[PDB]
Swiss-Prot record:
Similarity comment: family membership: Belongs to the metallo-beta-lactamase superfamily. Class-B beta-lactamase family.
Subunit structure, interactors included: Monomer.
Notes on how activity is controlled: Inhibits by captopril, thiorphan, dimercaprol and tiopronin. This enzyme is not susceptible to inactivation by the beta-lactamase-blocking agents clavulanic acid.
Gene that encodes it: blaNDM-1
Localization: Periplasm
Species for this entry: Klebsiella pneumoniae
Cellular component GO terms held in the UniProt record: periplasmic space
Function: Confers resistance to the different beta-lactams antibiotics (penicillin, cephalosporin and carbapenem) via the hydrolysis of the beta-lactam ring. Does not confer resistance to the polymixin colistin or the fluoroquinolone ciprofloxacin.
This protein's UniProt keywords: Antibiotic resistance, Hydrolase, Metal-binding, Periplasm, Plasmid, Signal, Zinc
Protein name, entry field: Metallo-beta-lactamase type 2
Disulfide linkage: none
Chain sites annotated for binding Zn(2+) 2: 96, 180, 222
Record GO biological process: antibiotic catabolic process; response to antibiotic
Amino acid sequence: NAIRPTIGQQMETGDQRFGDLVFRQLAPNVWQHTSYLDMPGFGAVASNGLIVRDGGRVLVVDTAWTDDQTAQILNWIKQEINLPVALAVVTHFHQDKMGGMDALHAAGIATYANALSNQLAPQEGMVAAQHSLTFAANGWVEPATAPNFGPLKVFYPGPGHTSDNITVGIDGTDIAFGGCLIKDSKAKSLGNLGDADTEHYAASARAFGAAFPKASMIVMSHSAPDSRAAITHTARMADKL
């Protein structure tokens, strides 16, 4: 029953609450952040993202739902990590998370999103990220658009849950972030399909899996971390579309 520990990793089970936020350490330099919104007709809905420590800076993947919740993420980073946040990558446009963008911009943090996300946001009357990511034909981000991204490996799998959904692998870890594209293996549904691409969704989910074949831990926007079973389950459900 002895467990071999990993230096810099909190080994015990027990998430940390910090205000409205919950933090879980996934690897010595990676944490999941989780916030909740009470959506009418749905109840509480989770938003998860990542905080990645890379050398003398922090990189953020995705925001919380609101300005105040995203400010709390920044306050947690100040308290627990004490390194500047160099940049944030936002993996899709979400009409309910604009408050989050505001908090990052107010803090002077450079924001990056899929070029298509930066079209969709102002089409819905919301601010774009400061910078646009573009992608090679193979789906990998063009390095000219993503300078100094450190261990973040950004991949556009094709349209799925939304037309603009991108994903992010973390080099040096077994973690990949599927954004809003992937749901967990206990999901009863693919969720709200109002912006979904039914024709390509299954293929996009499989492309994500093929892009990060070494990832054994899958983190997602609206479900708890899971094994690769999340990718399989998501693709199977999307096959029914």
